[PDB]
Amino acid sequence: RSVLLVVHTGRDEATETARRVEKVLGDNKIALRVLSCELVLVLGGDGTFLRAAELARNASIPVLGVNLGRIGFLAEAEAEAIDAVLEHVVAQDYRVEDRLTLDVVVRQGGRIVNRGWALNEVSLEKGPRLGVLGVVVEIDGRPVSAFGCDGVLVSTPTGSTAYAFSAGGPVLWPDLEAILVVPNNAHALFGRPMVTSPEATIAIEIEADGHDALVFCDGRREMLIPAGSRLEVTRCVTSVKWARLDSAPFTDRLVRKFRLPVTGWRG
Amino acid sequence: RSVLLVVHTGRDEATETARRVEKVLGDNKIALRVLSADQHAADGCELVLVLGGDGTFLRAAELARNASIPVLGVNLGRIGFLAEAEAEAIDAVLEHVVAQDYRVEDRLTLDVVVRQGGRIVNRGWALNEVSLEKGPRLGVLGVVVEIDGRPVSAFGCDGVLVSTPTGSTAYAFSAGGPVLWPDLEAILVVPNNAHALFGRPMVTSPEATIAIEIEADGHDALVFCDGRREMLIPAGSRLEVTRCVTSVKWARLDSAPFTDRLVRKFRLPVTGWRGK
Amino acid sequence: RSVLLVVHTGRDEATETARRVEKVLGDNKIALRVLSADQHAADGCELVLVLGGDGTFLRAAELARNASIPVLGVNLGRIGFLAEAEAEAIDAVLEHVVAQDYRVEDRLTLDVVVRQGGRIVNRGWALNEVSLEKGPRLGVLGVVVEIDGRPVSAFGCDGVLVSTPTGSTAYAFSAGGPVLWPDLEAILVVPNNAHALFGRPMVTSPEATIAIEIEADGHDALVFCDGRREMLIPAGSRLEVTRCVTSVKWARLDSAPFTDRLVRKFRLPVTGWRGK
Amino acid sequence: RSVLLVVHTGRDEATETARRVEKVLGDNKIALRVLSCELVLVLGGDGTFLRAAELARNASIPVLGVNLGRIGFLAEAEAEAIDAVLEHVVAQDYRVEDRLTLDVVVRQGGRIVNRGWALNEVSLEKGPRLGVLGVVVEIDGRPVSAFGCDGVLVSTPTGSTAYAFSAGGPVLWPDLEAILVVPNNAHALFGRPMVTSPEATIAIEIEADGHDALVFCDGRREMLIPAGSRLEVTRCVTSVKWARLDSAPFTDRLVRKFRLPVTGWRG
Structure with a gap:
């Protein structure tokens, strides 16, 4: 005890x-x-x-x-x-x-090279302070938008009052089961947040001839995301x-x- | 067969x-x-x-x-x-x-009830949105939005949308809503031109109750369901939106x-x- | 005194x-x-x-x-x-x-002209905003917004606001506008619930001309100036907003x-x- | 010649x-x-x-x-x-x-310790990728809001289609004379952009017990902004x-x- x-x-x-x-x-x-x-x-x-x-x-x-x-x-x-x-x-x-809770996979060459999890958010962000990160966001195996941005947040309903909120997202009630995607400073006409069933797969492809990018989970755990990788975020078992x-x-x-x-x- | x-x-x-x-x-x-585009026209x-x-x-x-x-x-x-x-x-x-x-x-689908002095005076449903909109073209409608028995915000506005995931692409989008996948079960609330610092879209579980109170002192207001079924909302009344069974x-x-x-x-x- | x-x-x-x-x-x-709150009431x-x-x-x-x-x-x-x-x-x-x-x-102050078939059919002014708003409660008004002789966007919407720096705090704010200091001379355009990817506020020099075209096929629309002076805008007409002399x-x-x-x-x- | x-x-x-x-x-x-x-x-x-x-x-x-x-x-x-x-x-x-064109002054202890200029924007940004930068924004010698944020952009009408746009700003015509301030991911109810006459002074105070922050002018020139400094941006002579x-x-x-x-x- x-x-x-x-x-x-x-x-x-x-x-x-x-x-x-x-x-x-x-x-x-x-x-x-x-x-x-x-x-x-x-x-x-x-x-x-x-x-x-x-x-x-x-x-x-x-x-x-x-x-x-x-x-x-x-x-x-x-x-x-x-x-x-x-x-x-x-x-x-x-x-x-x-x-x-969110599961995140970093995939390069079809191979899982890292992973993480988040109860609040997964924050994918620009590596070097100069410039923009080019990204393709995909929702259920299909591309939704490509743009340059400071990053992309994939957040739980619980993380919705945090960094996701600052980046322009809606407020989600904590008993909701859904996933929330907020483009962080997207240079595009369409950079609106999107909300998916909790069964969906969010994938984010990082430009292959850009710089390495970073992901922060729950504001504390850091993974390096190499140029040309694919981040996959799903609901964790x-x-x-x-x-x-x-x-x-x-x-x-x-x-x-x-x-x-x-x-x-x-x- | 037919x-x-x-x-x-x-x-x-x-x-x-x-x-x-x-x-x-x-x-x-x-x-x-x-x-x-006969309420019984598809009978059989x-x-x-x-x-x-x-x-x-x-x-x-x-x-x-x-x-x-x-x-x-x-x-x-x-x-x-x-x-x-x-x-x-x-x-x-x-x-x-x-x-x-x-x-x-x-x-x-959404259940919508109009309540006056504690009783149901009208009822409707929606697959896309419930849109509460100001009566007069002139002023502002004062509302209080209440989520699960508890007030979340009070403000003047052109109205308030309560939308399904399916409706999120429609008039809710125009008013600043997020895009929801039609796969999801949730309720979306989008304040329509709220004169307020906080007029952000809110998304709720499908078991939630959304209520909107209409100011007692002001003008009657209107509800449009899926852009066609209209009800009149008396001042001081209250709109309750839940998932229909x-x-x-x-x-x-x-x-x-x-x-x-x-x-x-x-x-x-x-x-x-x-x-990649 | 008088x-x-x-x-x-x-x-x-x-x-x-x-x-x-x-x-x-x-x-x-x-x-x-x-x-x-006698058009000549303060004469003298x-x-x-x-x-x-x-x-x-x-x-x-x-x-x-x-x-x-x-x-x-x-x-x-x-x-x-x-x-x-x-x-x-x-x-x-x-x-x-x-x-x-x-x-x-x-x-x-803003000059506003209603133009039909190349001629001026109505005229108004505003210190706060010109608000072009859809006639019917039902649908959407199709507009083309034109800035200095050139089209910038076409979309369906509830309307379009053309506001002074002074008006930016008012109905323009509710609709998503930036806050402008009353010190500034500029013109602000705020699409009102535009069903479009790009419905962003635009800000222009005070020598600009803002024109809005109203779809020829659709319903008449309305203009409200400073929330009280109303004109009717015929379908297919065109609204021109500039600074008044x-x-x-x-x-x-x-x-x-x-x-x-x-x-x-x-x-x-x-x-x-x-x-610090 | x-x-x-x-x-x-x-x-x-x-x-x-x-x-x-x-x-x-x-x-x-x-x-x-x-x-x-x-x-x-x-x-x-x-x-x-x-x-x-x-x-x-x-x-x-x-x-x-x-x-x-x-x-x-x-x-x-x-x-x-x-x-x-x-x-x-x-x-x-x-x-x-x-x-x-914008003039920028970095002031610490009432003393000018650096300066810069921008035809496009002055971008004040978080130093360390963890956390938020606390800021007080002041417009004509009077405070308008304090919040934590990723940063604050002060932009010309010309810079309005760039980073300022990505961060949520309106589009300004290039023959306009005004200054545009866009909070970058402000954790606050009010984080709307603000537009001022070109005669105004925008000042931004950085939290004194936070980390150092950075400013990028026109995406290329970099100044370190020490904790507790005041950035002043005006129209340059x-x-x-x-x-x-x-x-x-x-x-x-x-x-x-x-x-x-x-x-x-x-x-």
Whole structure:
């Protein structure tokens, strides 16, 4: 019976909240490892949660986030509610659900030369700051557009409020199963985002006489994409497991995060 | 058996394609009714066959769903998204109609209710979009958009579109929507010229409920479903859009995938594709 | 003195601010006419003074330009862009009205002509926008937009806006326009829900001519100027928008710069500014 | 009596068009220098023209472009028309006009630590590929928005069809005098482009505890922007001089470049 606890910076292991967790779980005959098992419990922002998710997937166990700083979308609770939260952690009475996760393959000469995964996005980007990356995007084995661009995002419904949003994308609800493709600064008439069923294959071909390009998954894991490769992104067989509490529904997290005007609501 | 044939106009009943349909099916002793884009007109038919553009197709789909039978469309002039073939392959199409051996799938449809003082005062459906639009040409309609029981934004606007994946290519696109594959089951919301910082398209699971509140103080507003069925929305009322339990039955042929339809309609640049 | 006062509604003639204006100017033996938002109503006046929102202001500016005199606006409830002060500083404002010592600048105005078969059949002007809008609620209006004698795009749409820098904050913004500083002299074109890959806003020099052609085969269309002056646009006709040689005379006070007006109206996040 | 001739790559000095120029001008007692005076004549695309413009400004003399490859916006003619073009070059009968050019100042501690200029754009961009650049944009001595972003473009009406276009900007006619500001992937509700009179000052403040950022002018000249600096962009006193021929007006160059649908035009 153990748990992994993840927290933001190095000094962050001693704060009130961390301390409270370490005390309460010890006292209940649960061992506890501290970084930065049956669960990964994490204290911090969305960026820190992504990390924790990264370790929860290796082990194939649920993640559960508790927010510390400025609010985000991924936490199931805030630091004020830690007692209530730890009560569900010791009891193990929380719902667990699979969340759509992306698989990415880098293919050169028909051969898989690398791979990755993302719960948030796969971000394909220009290598050298001079110029544009030429790309062909393909959706279900058929080409949709070729253009030069800063890149292309392939995002989950969960990643839709992040980099994908900045790049011009729509907002997708997190219980949706779909894949979202957002051209990042496409030099073209048509550079609109596209949304596909979760069964589809998105492939992106990188110009063969251009420079190497890069891909960042969940803003943290980096693969080099060689000139002339094909990136294939599909829904991964294996999902990340999310601990779910009785928390604010996404609409409220959206309104809160962007300070959305909601006055006049009757209901 | 019988087949209901839908054509665009009365003087389209005499087109070469339309003439072929009448000959072929007549030769196979399949009774044909013809009509120009009768709520019960396809009662007894095994299929609604349509020749024409996407707008004609939408009329045929209504009649097909009234009867609970498949709709199949062949396009004529204007290139579109919903037809399974072009006029030149009418013989091949007629072969599949006579043998009755095409696939039939469900296509998602939207339920729309108008609610005043807690009760349902009108109801409609859509395969393409529900478009809530301002009454007067003058001002702005104040709305609150509410997603799953919870308010997401309030703003003045020309209106709000609630669209299927199929409708995303239509009026939703014009208003700034993303392109959705007709393969997907989701609901798309597109604020129409919202005077607001946040007027972004939103996409929801197909089990979602989208509600829009119309300002109590202002003018009545209008709803257009699939560009033709109109309801009046009283000020202070509220529109509720969900997935309808009754889908349209969509005949399928071995036809071009949606990706090809998109590239063709918009002339999308595609050179250098398989190159890697 | 004389001054013409414009208020929003008849039962706004009795507001505390409106009452103050009548007292102050009456005490200085300045004749006051009052009216609610008379094409010649400000004939003889040295100023049109307005109390209310941006819409009320636009009515006053019309009357001021009819008389060739300055307009000055004070806002009441709703925060806007065109007033030079808020209600709470009415005494300070009245001081500048009595001494007649405010600056007056030219604000750019648009000339709009409706042309059929090579001749002018109607004419209008605008300080905010010209909005060409589809007649029927149903379909799409086909247009060709032509910039300086040359076609730039043809598409179906709900309409096309031709806006001043001042109007860019208004209906043009809702339709997806960029924000222009009222300092600039330019013309902005914003396609309204264009069903097209390219429906981007375009910005032109103030010496440009923007013409829009309305499809010959389709329905008549409508033009709204500054949200109130309506003309009917016959199918096959053509709208020509240029800068009018007659500007509006814009009284200025020591007021907030446009940047502050924008931040305030849209609640724009601004924290950490001078930090470098 | 001399002219500078600029051409794309190294092998490019021997092509039919270059050769024709070198012959015709020699024969007319005009000396000619060849790279990559009364005029800078340039053969190539928009990218090569930008370079030539860079050398025409040092000398304070007109540039005149003749297009070789795929069409752009800056050339006054194409390679088929070189004889006609050279006839105006020998005669010196062409119109010359000043085009709006941007001045940029990098200011740290109230002190000018660098500077640049642009006929196309000033592109302020994220330094390290991880994360976002925090920025405050100010327009006439007053703050308009703070956000994180990939960057901010400050563009001329001429640069509006380029990187600024890819980033979501409107199209501006080249005889307009204005300045265009386009937030590049702003994580904010308001990230719309803004257009100012040519008299205005655009300033951009970079977060003081972030990373250093970069600026690229006309896609070629690079300055490092230190954390906590202020970029100031104004209209430069000194303009680039453009040789003007009897060429396609910009509307036609737009339609041609993006293959814009124009059928049905009556006129």
